[PDB]
Each structure stands twice: as C-alpha cells, then as structure tokens.
Design a binder for these strands. Structure first.
Ligand SMILES: [K+]
Ligand SMILES: [K+]
Ligand SMILES: [K+]
Ligand SMILES: [K+]
Ligand SMILES: [K+]
Ligand SMILES: [K+]
Ligand SMILES: [K+]
Ligand SMILES: [K+]
Ligand SMILES: [K+]
Ligand SMILES: [K+]
Ligand SMILES: [K+]
Ligand SMILES: [K+]
Ligand SMILES: [K+]
Ligand SMILES: [K+]
Ligand SMILES: [Mg+2]
Ligand SMILES: [Mg+2]
Length: 1328
RNA sequence: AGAGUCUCUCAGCUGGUACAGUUUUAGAGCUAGAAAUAGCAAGUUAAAAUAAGGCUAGUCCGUUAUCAACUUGAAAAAGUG
DNA sequence: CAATACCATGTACCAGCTGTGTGACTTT
DNA sequence: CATGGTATTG
C-alpha cells in the first residue's frame, strides 16, 4: 500500500492530504472513543489544522524591561530615604510614613491626611508659596536660608525620581552655552579664515533668531536675511545650517568634486568631518568645531527659555515661566469669553466631557486636542491674537509635566540637585558627607554591557561580581567586574569559527583579517599583455609590491590604479587586461589607514613584531564601547605612543566580527610546507590557491586538521534555533507533528514522496524613512504637503514622497492631486520577477516613458536619471538593490541568461527556511544507510513554489475562493502532492532541483514550458491523451480520468478542519486602571486596595474554562443545590487553581465538587449539538461558530469567474463570460445554500432576514458586483468568531453567542492534530 | 549543496535608560437658600502604584515558545485506534 | 434574557549579536 | 486590527 503526502505550511494553517497511486485520497473507518453510541466514523484523509499566530518575544521583553525600570526607580528613592532616615526622624517621625500611604483614603490612613507637614494650615501655606514643585526647586537652589528638611527631601526626590535621559556624555556648561557668544565666536573664527570676505554681524540678534520656536530651516532663513550679501547656501549659511541640526553640503563651498554632506547627529559625522578636513586642511577644524558648540547652545535653548544669569535653576525657572504665562493667559482668556460670548463659558471651563479647559485639566483632553477645540474660539473673538500666536507655536496654557520633557538631559536636573546640596550642606552636616552619595544616586545607571544584577536566578543575566555582596550605586566599580561582564556581553553572542569550533572569530576590522581578505582576492587576479601567451597569476613578489604600493597608500584600489600605478610604473606595460576583479577591489586595508592617521608611524605598522600589539588594540576597540574601559585596557601601551595619540586611539571604535579565527588565518600550518593559510595567500608558487582551495586540498594538512577540530537538540529546540519569524516556526513544528500522525495512520508505512509548499505599525517606519530622506535631501516637500503616517499606506502617495514629488523616468515634477492618472511600474518586469514591493516599483507619469517593456529601463532613461537616482540612494529613499536594477541597462541590461534564471526562480524554491523544513522531514524519514554508507532516500521531500499549483488551478478551472471556508488550505496540499509527484514522475532528472538531498534560450523555453504536459493543446500544438515517462514507460498522467479524480477530491464535503485548542496566556487583563465603581468586575491592583475605594482592572483573560459539577448554596437559607456550569479560570487565577483545584473551587462557592468530572476546556473546545450544529468555546461565557459551509464546486467556480477574482485568451474569456450568464440562476441557488445552512447551524434570525432583504434589494445590480458581495456574505457562515460584514452598502453587525449553557448538555469532541482520532463525551450524562 | 568578501535590505534575540498616561489621596472653594440648586471663584502641582505577586530574597523573577483525549507514572514520558 | 454599543497603554533614545535575500568577485 | 469583556437598554 503506497501513498504520498502533500503539505501547505502557513502562519495560521497547515493543510495536509494523503494521495495514492491514482492521485486519489483514501478514506478509512476510524475508532471513536467516549461514552456515545457511535463507535467509529468514516474520514477522508484530507484536512487542515488552524491555529492562532505565534508571537514574538518582543512585547514580553519590553514589559520585562519596564518592570526592572520601576523596581530600580523605587530603589533609588529607598536609597535617598535611607540617607535621610535618622535626621528626618528628629524633625518629623512620620513624614516618610505619610508619603508611603499617600494613595490610601483617610479611612485607611494610619496618620494625618496632609502629607508634607501633617496639618491643614501648614499644607495650605506650602501650596500657596510653591504652587508647583519647580517653585520649591528654584527657591532651594537660589536661597541662602536654612530650609525645612522635608522640603529638601521633596526637591531631591523629585529630581532623582524623574532624572532625565543619558543621551549626552560628559558634563554640561549652562553658562558656556550662550547662543549670542557662540554665534559671535563662530563669526570670529570665520573672519579669521576669510579676511578678504568678512561678515558684518552687528545689530543681528542671534539669541532671539536661533532660539526661536521655529523650524530649523526657517530660523536659518531668518538669520541669513539679517546678513546682506550672504546666502543660506554660502559657507557661513551652511555652518549655521549645521548648527541648527540640518544636513548641509559643503562640496560646493570648497570647490570639491565629491560631496561632503554633514549632519551633527549622524554617527558618521566624526569620520565625515575628518574626511572633509583631509581635503581642505586643518585650518578649518576651528571653524567646524566652533559651529558644533553653537549647536549645543541652541539645543539647550529649546529647554532653557530663561536667562541663565538670574538663577542657577534655569530649568525650574522655565517651568515657572510656563506656570506664570498659563496663569496670565487663563485670566485673560476667561475675561474674553466672559464678555465676548458668555454662553460658551460653561462648556469651556466646566464640562470635562468637552475638550475645553475643563476637559484639558480634569478630563481626558490632551494638549493637542485642547488646541484644536479652542483654535476657532480664539479666531472668532477679538483680542486673541497673542494667544493665537502662542497656540501655533504650541506654547499656550502649558502644563509643566508634558510629553516633550524627554528633551531634558539628566545633567540639568543634576545641576539643580548639586546646587541645593551645596546650599543646605551648610546647615545639615549629613548633607555635606552624603553630597556625593546623593549625587551618585541620580547619575548612576547600570552599564548596558553589565545587565541584570542577578545572583544565579536570571536566565537573562551574565554579570560576574568581583566580590559577593550587595551592589549599590556607590560600590559598583568595586563589586561588579565591569571588564569581564563587558566581555561576556559580546562573547555570549558572537559566533565561533565553524572550521575551528573552539576558536573565537576575529574582529571584522582586525588588521590581520583584512590582510587575509585582500590577499585572498588579490591571489585570484589574472593579467595578460602582448607578449604573453596566456593570462597569468600574480607572483608572491607582485602581490606584495601591489599591497605595499597601492593598498598601503590608498584606502580603495581601482583597476585603473592597478594598471597605471603598478603595471605601467613597475612592469612598463602600456596596456594590460585584468580579470578576477572589476572596477575596484572589494577588499581594503581600512584599519591600516585609520591607524596610520592616528599614530603616524608607518614603520611601526609594517613591523611584524608589532602584529600582536596591533591585534590586541583593535580587539579592545571592538570588544568595548566605553571610553574609560577602552582607555584602561590600552594602558599597557601608553609607553608606545604620545598622550595625543593615545587620546586619538581612545576615540576610535570599531563594531562587527569576522567569520574566521586567528588560528585559522595565520596559526595552523601545513605539515610539510610549514606555512599558514595567509602564507599561501601571499605566495603559493604558480597555483595561487585561495582560501576555499587550501582547506580542501588533500595534498595539504589543513583539511585533515579541520575535520579533527570539529566536535544534540530536540525537534522543538532545533526549530526554535532556525532563522525565521516565530510565526512560521509554529507552523513548521505543527507540520512535523502532522506528518508523524499521518504515518501512524498508515500503519507506520512511510510515504513515497512528501511535497511541501510554504506560503509567502509600518506607517511609523514609512514616515521616518521620508522625513530622514527629505531632510537629508534638503527638500521642502513636507512643508508644502503635510502628510500623516496612515496615508503612507497608499502606494502611489508613498512612492510620491520617496521620489520627492518627481517622475522617476522623466526629470519633471509630479502633481500630488493627479496621482490617480499616474502609473506604478515595475523596474524588472513582473513577467520575469514577480516582485510588487516598493523595492521593484516606481511612480512615473506614464509607463511608456520607461522604454521597451521586455527589459529593465532603457539606456536613455538611465543616462537621463542616474544622478537623481544617486541622490535618492544617499537619502535612503531607494535601496542599493533598487538603484542597481534601475541602472542595469548601462551594464548591458537584462541578458538572456538572466531571463532564464528569473523563470527558473518562479518554479524552484530557494528560501533557506524552506530548505530547513525539508532537511527536517528528510532526516526524520530516511534513517538507514546502504553498502556504501550513503543515505537511503526512501522518502523524497519535494518543495514547490505556490505559483505552480496556483497556475494549475487557473489553467484547469480548479479555482479557490478563500472567503467561502477553510477548505482551500486542505485542497492546496492535495494539489501540491498531485502536481509534485506527477512532475517528478514525468521528468526524473528534475530531482536535483526539487528533491532535498545531495543555451539560455533553451532553459528559458524549457522552464517556461515545463508544465505543458498536463495540457492537451498548447498555444497550435497538441499532445497525447496519456502522458508517460520516456525511459521507464510508466504512465504519469491520463488527461481524461485523472482530472476527474482531482475534481472528485475537491468536491468532497467532508474535510477535517481542526482549530488547535490553546490555553490562553499573556496579560492578566486590560491594562487600563479604571476609576472606582461598585461592580464585582473590578480587580484590585494591590492586595489591600479595595476596588470600590481605589478602582482597578477589569476584563481578565480566561486561560481556560473548567466544567464544574458540584452544589452551591442557595438563598439566605443556604440550601445545597446541584449544578453543572462553566467556570473561566483567569490567567491570574491559573497557578492558584492548579496547585489545589478543590480548595480553589470551594473558595469560589462550589461544594461537594465531583473531582473526577472536572474537564479542562481550552479556547476553541469543540461541541456538537443537534442537527450537526457545532460550537467552539470562545470563553467561559461566549461561543464561536463551529461549522464549515461545504459549498459545492460548481458554485465555487461560478463565484470565482463571476466575481472576476483574478487571464486567458479572448475565446476563453468570452466562453467563461457566457458560462456565467448561462448559469445566472446559481446566484439564487447560492443564497439558498447559505440560508439553508444558516437556519441549520448559524441561528441568527435577524441577520439572515436582513441579508435576504439586501440580496432581494440589489437584484438589478450587475452580476459581477452581486457576486463580489455574495463573497462578503460567507462571513455570516465562516467558522470562528462572529464578525460584521457589508452586503453592498448595508451593514450586518455580528450576532454573538453570549451564553455557553447549551454545551453543558451537548457532545464534547476531543480531536487529534489531524482530527482523524476522536473522543466524544456526551455531557448530558453528567450531573444526574 | 555550499564558503569568504563588497554594498546593502529585511528579520530575530538580549541589555541599559527616558517621557507621558492612568488611578487614589493632598492642594481649606465662596456666596445665597432648609434643601433642591443658582451665581461665582478655582484649575497648571505632588506622593504612591504601574501586571495580583513569588522565593531563590537578587538593585532577582513574573505576558515569548510548548499544550486533544486516554493508560500507566509523583512527575518526565512512553504507549493506545 | 435580546440587540446594541463602546472599549482596548502609548511614545522616545542608546548599546550590541545573529541570519536573511540581494547581486556582484572568487572558489569546493 | 479583532474579538472578548462590560454595561446599557429595553
Ligand atoms: K529594549
Ligand atoms: K485615620
Ligand atoms: K541675505
Ligand atoms: K487632561
Ligand atoms: K488633579
Ligand atoms: K483674532
Ligand atoms: K500629570
Ligand atoms: K568590485
Ligand atoms: K565597540
Ligand atoms: K608616552
Ligand atoms: K501561548
Ligand atoms: K501552557
Ligand atoms: K486538539
Ligand atoms: K547584515
Ligand atoms: Mg513591583
Ligand atoms: Mg506622572
């Protein structure tokens, strides 16, 4: 008995089917377990497992990270309170107690209700003197008087609790960042370099202009407007633009041929500046550094909007400025409305529900919403002009705690913290001794390379301690081994050398590693001149001369440099042909040139004895990112370089790791030669073997040593470690579990073949890619055309912005209002490359202007547009892949071989994850070896792409309509098995391409015509009825009988669709903290916080339901009453219930619980009632639809054709259209089937009647549109959670199943993973 | 079937921080009326919690992955049509 | 109990490692 | 998002 398996692997489904010799699906009688009168059932061997998408670990991680955050912020406060403990006890022995219980209601408070002082008089006086915390912070920073210890704590706690970000390194000078003085010094540094062309900056108010609440470009234009004879694109203008955070281009200033675009935010700027400074000299370093300082001052002026010469608390001062202008503007705003229109006053200042001032302070109105609600109310009135200016600057009626306070660095809070400590350490001796300890609390943060401060109970931790004691902010440098921990942070993630599995991989930028990559490429170069008979390799001398002369003097080596600076200069060749490298060498001694600039000792770099030291310095620069730690590690060589060079060495940091170890490159040696790998790359006679040849050569001992160097996951573990979406990995494991069961079903007989086919908030990302691209481009298109992230979901508008509002084939502007008239065109034609991503797509006025349509854009378009494309590439508005394709016509365009490859890739799957599934299945099936110790491939694992079966369906009218039911998953798998087996049966030579295990015109023709053998006529040409294998003579396909077989299988109504039951996990409930309410739905946020007094959560998530048969007390009498009901065990209750189910249930009220009748009921548990009606458990108190509507095939194909689902010849198109119109009565028949089914299992009288009326209303509608909208109707009958749907313009809301009472007496069905094995439990026989 | 390199792209996993939001309390509302309410005044801030919580008590852990039923079995697992 | 309606924590930055598909050079 | 929780209204 022989058979094959077909699989369809998706992210929510695994379709499966068993086929025989004749492409038939078998049917078996299967045992049925349980207490029903049915002992067995007939099942077709075809079905599909359905499951909810697997989730990533990200959300779990972000929540984990926040938890740690909250724990450590509490610890900071506890540290500070510990310091204050004894001395605060002398002043107020319950202060910290009133703070701790501030949340409680006075009924539960054990102390007085006024937290700071403990009486109403002092408390009210406090708030009158210090309405915001920032008033108190400024007073404590400025005043010279002794202050109450409790107010000192509150100001220091507020700074430590909300301490600001750590994005800036070093200390901040609040007086050294004066915008006027940094602008004056930029002017002075410019006038030094350009004495003949100086700028008159007198009368220019640099402070107001650059610190103004305006866009960077507008402030730039404002300042230049004050300077006559200076343009914003001149050198000075560009420097101001750099200061404002824009991205200017200094190429045109210094007459450069290449482009020096500079932005101060990019990580590349440090190199970007040095690179520019290399061309124009170091005299300009003072100019470009002076501009950097100005930027710092302007950034601070966004935060500090107050003169820093009247207070040492400019931040708190600026918060107080917000409060004062809020108060003044509120007084005036009220007066205006009071007089100009008093009818709206009640709506504005008293209605929390409205987005007025009441809703903005007391309700849920945000600043953005408040501004919207009040913008017309201001425009409508008189005297509102200044307020309207503040509203448009987003600076009206501001609160102090706002979304934009993320700008504040921690150095500013620290400055006020250190000032207060300096003021009060004069009166309190414990503040002078703990001044630094308190300062450390605010400033300390765990280094990212240290991680959780665990003690052997964190699977996430790696930190190692220098001593076993409690870590605090003050002892961290001593208890935590920062060096070892920083090393583990990387070495626990990096790859080992695959060849030498115990050797660590070299840093990517290691000098030795780059010597290797350059010699390995250089060794395969070949050249030929006139006198030479044939091309030749480079000798060891030639390669060394080339490395010394070119690679050690030029960052990148082009072929031109090789020809002129080597072959002409040295070999005296006026002409030479080069091979093995094109345009320029891909490898380069980059680190060599970085170190030559820093240390300026070329002879040190070339001395081989320094190889070790240089290797350790680069390793240290790569391994660590902390500049102190880097400095500490490089101390060993402080004697070798100047302090200036050592400082420059500290600042140079590298990232990335190679793929080979040092031991492999330049350690192990060949036994007879005594030479390392690098030695052979430098010199290997006239064979010039490269890395691949060396480690594979049997005449050397490298290969032997590799195998000796080499040194068991579970199925689940192995799948977890695959590179791919966790979603697809869930289906991969489910697939293997499906195959195991199917083999057990066939009496442990292995199949002949297994054919597998695998399926194929971004608006935040799409917006960020256009902002960066446009600001890098320097364009004002976002100014002229504001856009929201949601709109960028539209393809044409997204392409418009990525192309900066220009046609991509013609150098012209595009109209944003005309996009409907424009064309979206594929760079590589979709006839060749089925790619619809933005990466192969282009917005043009008309696709005609691309050129010819059988190739990549014409040469003329490339000549026209290459430069504009280059800008888009650098602005990252197109990728390198998109630019390369866009420009291929200048590289010959698409070749015939390229076209052959494209067609082949349409048919042969090459994705790595697909190969891994095949390898998993192949290694599970084929386990025995033959006389030659080679694997015996009893089972052939075939992998197909989705296009094969999809074209099969459209070619033989086996159409699919996904919306009808879930059967198409199972049918896809059947067709995969059929097509896959028949394909390799017809052409056994294909096995190399389609089975796992180990002229261009011809292949193009061949692969385009590979599937013709199924057809009876082609294009013209005709074929036999019976198709056979040429060699064996065996029949593979009968075009009369075998299509009928397929048609029978797709028509079968019984298909085993199983929805994987799953225990729900994750969050306990909705996260929203709700206000207090008298409802038992509310759940306490802490053990003692009664939700009736404090609010809390609701909407818990049921992990699984439980069938309880027990008795419950009834009435005031408490008489025991027998019941049977469903209890949802929430995720939070789950551990408590499982530890002791009986105690848990008795706590809930149940008595005499029949412990053995407790049934665990996860989500999607399956119940059958009367007339075949099936329900799935959505929750403990809601149900989902549990039936599939097996619509007959004739209707399915009619719906597909009538609806124009997806082309064919005209004689075919008209034949299909004629069939649609000849079978128009099918429309009513389809409705009848739906209604017959809805009345049998759906049971939504209201919705069914509403739909019938809607269908009888739109009978005069076109047939195509009636069919398209019949497709929507299957939502009413679709398996799963009910949902809303629209028939034409009528909307049908979901009818839900809000009670689970009926399943308590129905038949519960437990299914195996295929659903072929069943246990059925009559629940009516329980509770008697 | 792979391997190294160059320019990239997309994805996965981990760590260190920040700002808001929400919730309860505190921030004496006034006047006139028995009240009902009306007319006003006010508003910007803070503490605390931010999965209940756990023992292993760490400045640690708590939302990913995995899961029909039955039989033996503390459990892990294997077995069952 | 129907039918019906409303609701659902969000944002920002920094430091890493891995594999992926891409199209080029070289190779087993 | 989409689907389960919750309340309101009849
Ligand atoms: K993170
Ligand atoms: K009390
Ligand atoms: K000017
Ligand atoms: K608000
Ligand atoms: K409040
Ligand atoms: K106005
Ligand atoms: K707030
Ligand atoms: K190249
Ligand atoms: K580094
Ligand atoms: K020195
Ligand atoms: K789960
Ligand atoms: K579980
Ligand atoms: K199941
Ligand atoms: K990469
Ligand atoms: Mg906690
Ligand atoms: Mg807050």
């Amino acid at each position: 008995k022989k058979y094959s398996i077909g699989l369809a692997i998706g992210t929510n489904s695994v379709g499966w089917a068993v086929i025989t010799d004749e492409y038939k699906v078998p049917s078996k009688k299967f045992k049925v377990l349980g207490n029903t009168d049915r002992h067995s059932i007939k099942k077709n061997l075809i079905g599909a497992l359905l499951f909810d998408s697997g989730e990533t670990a990200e959300a779990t991680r972000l929540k984990r990270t926040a938890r740690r955050r909250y724990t450590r912020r509490k610890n900071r406060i506890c540290y500070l309170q510990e310091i204050f403990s004894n001395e605060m006890a002398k002043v107020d022995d319950s202060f910290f107690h009133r703070l701790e219980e501030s949340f409680l209601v006075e009924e539960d408070k054990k102390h007085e209700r006024h937290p700071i002082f403990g009486n109403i008089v002092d408390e009210v006086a406090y708030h009158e003197k210090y309405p915001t915390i920032y008033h108190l912070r400024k007073k404590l920073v400025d005043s010279t008087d002794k202050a109450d210890l409790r107010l000192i704590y509150l100001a220091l706690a507020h700074m430590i609790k909300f301490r600001g970000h750590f994005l800036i390194e070093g200390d901040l000078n609040p007086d050294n960042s004066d915008v006027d003085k940094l602008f004056i010094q930029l002017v002075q540094t410019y006038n030094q370099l350009f004495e003949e062309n100086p700028i008159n900056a007198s009368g220019v108010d640099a402070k107001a202009i650059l610190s103004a609440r305006l866009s960077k470009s507008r402030r730039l234009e404002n300042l230049i407007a004050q300077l006559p004879g200076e343009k914003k694109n001149g050198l000075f203008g560009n420097l101001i633009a750099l200061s404002l955070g824009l991205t200017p281009n200094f190429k045109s200033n210094f007459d450069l041929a290449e482009d020096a675009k500079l932005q101060l935010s990019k990580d590349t700027y440090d190199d970007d500046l040095d690179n520019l400074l290399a061309q124009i000299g170091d005299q300009y370093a003072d100019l470009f550094l002076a501009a950097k300082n100005l930027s710092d001052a302007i950034l601070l002026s966004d935060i500090l909007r107050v003169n820093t010469e009247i207070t040492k608390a400019p931040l708190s001062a600026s918060m107080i400025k917000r409060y004062d202008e809020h108060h003044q503007d509120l007084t005036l705003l009220k007066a205006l409305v009071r007089q100009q229109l008093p009818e709206k006053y009640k709506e504005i200042f008293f209605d929390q529900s409205k987005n007025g001032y009441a809703g903005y302070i007391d309700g849920g109105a945000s600043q953005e919403e408040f501004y919207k609600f009040i913008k017309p109310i201001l425009e409508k009135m008189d005297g509102t002009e200044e307020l309207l200016v503040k509203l448009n600057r987003e600076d009206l009626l501001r609160k102090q705690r706002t979304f934009d306070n993320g700008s504040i660095p921690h150095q500013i809070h620290l400055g006020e913290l250190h000032a207060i400590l300096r003021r009060q350490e004069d009166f309190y001796p414990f503040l002078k001794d703990n001044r630094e300890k308190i300062e450390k609390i605010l400033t300390f943060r765990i280094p990212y390379y240290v991680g959780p401060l665990a003690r052997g109970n964190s699977r996430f931790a790696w930190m190692t301690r220098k001593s076993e004691e409690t870590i605090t902010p003050w002892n961290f440098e001593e208890v935590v081994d920062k060096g070892a921990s920083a090393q583990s942070f990387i070495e626990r993630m990096t790859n080992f050398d695959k060849n030498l599995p115990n050797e660590k991989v070299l840093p990517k930028h290691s000098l030795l590693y780059e010597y290797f990559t350059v010699y390995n490429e250089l060794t395969k170069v070949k050249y030929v001149t006139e006198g030479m008979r044939k091309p030749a390799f480079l000798s060891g001398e030639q390669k060394k001369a080339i490395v010394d002369l070119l690679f050690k003097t030029n960052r990148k080596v082009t072929v031109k440099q090789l020809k002129e600076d080597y072959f002409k200069k040295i070999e005296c060749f006026d002409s030479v042909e080069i091979s093995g490298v094109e345009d320029r060498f891909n490898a380069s001694l980059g680190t060599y040139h970085d170190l030559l600039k820093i240390i300026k000792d070329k002879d040190f770099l070339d001395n081989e004895e320094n190889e070790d030291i240089l290797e350790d310095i680069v390793l240290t620069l790569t391994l660590f990112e902390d500049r102190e730690m880097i400095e500490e590690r490089l101390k060993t060589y402080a004697h070798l370089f100047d302090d200036k060079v050592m400082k420059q060495l500290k600042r140079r940091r590298y990232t990335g790791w190679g793929r080979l170890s040092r031991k492999l490159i330049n350690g192990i040696r060949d036994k007879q030669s005594g030479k390392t790998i690098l030695d052979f790359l430098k010199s290997d006679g006239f064979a010039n073997r490269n890395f691949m040849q060396l480690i594979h050569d049997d005449s050397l001992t490298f290969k032997e040593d590799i195998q000796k160097a080499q040194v068991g996951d579970s199925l689940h573990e192995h799948i977890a470690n695959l590179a791919g979406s966790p979603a697809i990995k869930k289906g991969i494991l489910q697939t293997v579990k499906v195959v195991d069961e199917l083999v057990k079903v066939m009496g442990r007989h292995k199949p002949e073949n297994i054919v597998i086919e695998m399926a194929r908030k971004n608006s935040r990302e799409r917006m960020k890619r256009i902002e960066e691209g446009i600001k890098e481009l320097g364009s004002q298109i976002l100014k002229e055309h504001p856009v929201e992230n949601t709109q960028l979901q539209n393809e044409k508008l997204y392409l418009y912005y990525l192309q900066n509002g220009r046609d991509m084939y013609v150098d012209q502007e595009l109209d944003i209002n005309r996009l409907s008239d424009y064309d979206v065109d594929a760079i590589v034609p979709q006839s060749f490359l089925k790619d619809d991503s933005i990466d192969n797509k282009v917005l043009t006025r008309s696709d005609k202007n691309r050129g010819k349509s059988d190739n990549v854009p014409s040469e003329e378009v490339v000549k026209k547009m290459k430069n504009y494309w280059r800008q888009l590439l650098n602005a990252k508005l197109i990728t390198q892949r998109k630019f390369d394709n866009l420009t291929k016509a200048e590289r010959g365009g698409l070749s015939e071989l390229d076209k052959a490859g494209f067609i082949k890739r349409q048919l042969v799957e090459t994705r790595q994850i697909t190969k891994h599934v095949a390898q998993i299945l192949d290694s599970r099936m084929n386990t025995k070896y033959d006389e030659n110790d080679k694997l015996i491939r009893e089972v052939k694992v075939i992998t197909l792409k989705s296009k094969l079966v999809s074209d099969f369906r459209k070619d033989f009218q086996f159409y699919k309509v996904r919306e009808i039911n879930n059967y198409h998953h199972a049918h896809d798998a059947y067709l995969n098995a059929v097509v896959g087996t028949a394909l390799i049966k017809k052409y056994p030579k294909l096995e190399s391409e389609f089975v796992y295990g180990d002229k261009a015109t011809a292949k193009y023709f061949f692969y385009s015509n590979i599937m013709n053998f199924f057809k009876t006529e082609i294009t013209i040409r005709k074929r036999p009825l019976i198709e056979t294998n040429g060699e064996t003579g065996e029949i593979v396909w009968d075009k009369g009988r075998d299509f009928a077989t397929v048609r029978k299988v797709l028509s079968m109504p019984q298909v085993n669709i199983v929805k994987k039951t799953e225990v729900q996990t994750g969050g306990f409930s909705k996260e929203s903290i709700l206000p207090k309410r008298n409802s038992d739905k509310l759940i306490a946020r802490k053990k003692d916080w009664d939700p009736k007094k404090y609010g809390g959560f609701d909407s818990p998530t049921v992990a699984y339901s439980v069938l309880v048969v027990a008795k419950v007390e009834k009435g005031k009498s408490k008489k025991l009453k027998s019941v049977k009901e469903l209890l949802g065990i929430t995720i939070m209750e789950r551990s408590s219930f499982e530890k002791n189910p009986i105690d848990f249930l008795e706590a809930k009220g149940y008595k005499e619980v029949k412990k053995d009748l407790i049934i665990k009921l996860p989500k999607y548990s399956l119940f059958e009632l009367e007339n075949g009606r099936k329900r799935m458990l959505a929750s403990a108190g809601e149900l989902q639809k549990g039936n599939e509507l097996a619509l007959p095939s004739k209707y399915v194909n009619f719906l597909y054709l009538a609806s124009h689902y997806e082309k064919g010849s005209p004689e075919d198109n008209e034949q299909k259209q004629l069939f649609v119109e000849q079978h128009k009565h099918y429309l009513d028949e389809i409705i009848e089937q739906i209604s017959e089914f809805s009345k049998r299992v759906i049971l939504a009288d209201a919705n069914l009647d509403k739909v019938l009326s809607a269908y009888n209303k739109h009978r005069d509608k076109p047939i195509r549109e009636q069919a398209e909208n019949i497709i929507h109707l299957f939502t009413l009958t679709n398996l799963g959670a009910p949902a809303a749907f629209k028939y034409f313009d009528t909307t049908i809301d979901r009818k839900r199943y809000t009670s689970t009472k009926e399943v308590l007496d129905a038949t519960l069905i437990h299914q195996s993973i295929t659903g072929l094995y069943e246990t059925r439990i009559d629940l009516s026989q329980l509770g008697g």
